[PDB]
């Protein structure tokens, strides 16, 4: 039988938080609108005894042209800063309510290579702090 506590899903959290300002999903189909954020997890650690979780989240921004890509990256960074500062409540797809413990910016948006020669990709990296909520 499984354990009774687990942290909220980090990717779902970030998607449901960024969605009101710009289109976002874990994966991008072959065709979509330019404004677009992609979420991923690279590293983390969970401690059942202390209820401590330290996930690392990556955001990729795709847009047509350098100007639009930079503007989208700036908007996304501002949204993340708002989330870090005001500690708002986010409703997931499942309807559960989840919150954060803290936040920190590791890499401010920079330019990365991409196969498509018109779409410009910007990449930012963030660190989060989360606790354990009871499994419903």
């Amino acid at each position: 039988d499984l354990h009774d506590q687990d942290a909220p899903d980090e990717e779902d959290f970030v998607v449901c938080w960024m969605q009101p300002v710009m289109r976002t999903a874990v994966e991008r189909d072959i065709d979509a609108e330019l404004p677009f954020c992609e979420v991923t997890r690279i590293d983390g650690a969970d401690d059942p005894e202390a209820g401590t979780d330290d996930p690392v989240i990556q955001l990729d921004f795709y847009a047509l042209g350098a100007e639009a890509a930079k503007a989208a990256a700036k908007q996304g960074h501002r949204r993340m800063l708002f989330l870090f500062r005001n500690f708002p409540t986010v409703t997931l797809s499942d309807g559960t309510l989840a919150d954060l413990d803290f936040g920190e910016t590791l890499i401010k948006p920079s330019r990365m290579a991409f196969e498509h020669d018109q779409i410009v990709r910007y990449t930012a990296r963030y660190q989060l702090g989360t606790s354990y909520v009871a499994v419903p």
Binding site: G51, F87, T89, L97, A98, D101, G129, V133
Partner: protein, 257 residues
């Protein structure tokens, strides 16, 4: 005559909900002068009724607590009635409101036995420390240079930012009594949990090193509390003086039971 397993018996029961403010992202400290009866912050009365509390009746925090407010990037004095409190700004990473108590004991030694015969608490103290980055705030400047924030009549003397000119440190100073509240705010499942400490009186104990430069650091102030005589509470239903009280409350806290 029956022994249960450790898991069933409850020997491994834990709950992160009871964790304090040792992991949080919301902290704040507020201070003001201490004028005896006019600045009494005792939580209870003689009978046991609630006297004062930073938490509102609804369970939220109060709003009339502060004296200055920031609106649209402009420092304007509050026109609504208020007790009058000043809020410190940012805190450097790895440094925050912390307390480092030091305890001393004396042991009685008898030739009869090697083990100590008895011990007692000789001296005790509980100082705290915080690092402020907004060192150009008039309140912080007055706090560092040992100046009164309010006059004898109790009227405020702290100026709005960018109004007063360069301050000064007097040749001879005098001990000033100050009040402090340390805030730890933690939210879980869309419910707030509050942990606030209270200090009726506190003096300036020691300063910290500060350096100019590209990567310079700001000073770190240190204070020590001292029994004033106007701080009373229901300790086990018994009116008697104390030195520090902690407020716990919030919708999250009440949901534990």
């Amino acid at each position: 005559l029956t022994g249960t397993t450790p898991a069933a018996g409850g020997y491994t029961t834990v709950d992160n909900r009871l964790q304090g403010g040792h992991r949080t992202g919301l902290i704040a400290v507020a201070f003001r002068d201490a004028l005896g009866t006019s600045t009494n912050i005792s939580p209870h009365n003689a009978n046991g009724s609630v006297r004062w509390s930073p938490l509102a009746q609804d369970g939220q925090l109060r709003d009339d607590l502060f004296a200055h407010r920031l609106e649209n990037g402009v420092w304007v004095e509050n026109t609504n009635p208020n007790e009058g409190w000043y809020l410190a700004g940012a805190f450097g990473e790895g440094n925050g409101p912390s307390s480092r108590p030091s305890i001393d004991t004396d042991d009685q030694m008898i030739e009869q036995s090697n083990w100590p015969f008895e011990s007692d608490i000789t001296k005790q103290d509980e100082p705290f420390t915080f690092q402020a980055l907004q060192n150009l705030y008039p309140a912080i400047q007055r706090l560092a240079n040992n100046l009164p924030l309010s006059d004898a009549n109790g009227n405020p003397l702290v100026e709005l930012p960018g109004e007063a000119d360069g301050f000064s440190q007097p040749v001879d100073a005098e001990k000033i009594g100050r009040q402090f509240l340390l805030y730890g705010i933690r939210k879980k499942e869309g419910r707030y949990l509050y942990e606030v400490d209270a200090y009726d009186l506190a003096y300036l104990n020691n300063k910290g090193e500060r350096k100019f430069g590209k990567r310079g650091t700001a000073a770190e102030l240190t204070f020590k509390p001292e029994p004033s005589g106007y701080f009373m509470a229901m300790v086990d239903g018994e009116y008697k003086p104390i030195i520090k009280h902690t407020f716990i409350g919030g919708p999250a806290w009440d949901a534990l039971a």
